[PDB]
Design a protein around this nucleic acid. Structure first.
Length: 96
DNA sequence: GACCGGAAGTG
DNA sequence: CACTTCCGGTC
């Protein structure tokens, strides 16, 4: 609850215990979803939204492209790359 | 079945 | 605004 998808993914990636569903892989920023159904299952669970799937989660990721929060790793399947430009901005404080 | 982005809905 | 839902492209 309250939590951004970009934050949720950093959360999982920060602990190598979650390697079986998501893990850093490649250049600075690059990660891949080893089990995207499980990643999406947890994201629905977190948001109380049990019809969540990879196809919906990924549309969320795709919206991050214009926001410069992340970008697709072309050719690698389930792999994306966080972009510091937009994360820095997203990390800044906001009213509540 | 990715992956894409348009379009419409949500609180 | 930051997603969720849905769906018709294209590979």
């Amino acid at each position: 609850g309250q939590i951004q998808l970009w934050q949720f993914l950093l959360e999982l990636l920060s602990d190598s215990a979650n390697a079986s569903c998501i893990t850093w892989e490649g250049t600075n920023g690059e990660f891949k979803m080893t089990d995207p159904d499980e990643v999406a299952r947890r994201w629905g669970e977190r948001k109380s939204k049990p019809n969540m799937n990879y196809d919906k989660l990924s549309r969320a990721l795709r919206y991050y492209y214009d926001k410069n929060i992340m970008t697709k790793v072309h050719g690698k399947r389930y792999a994306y790359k966080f972009d510091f430009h937009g994360i820095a901005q997203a990390l800044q404080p906001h009213p509540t």
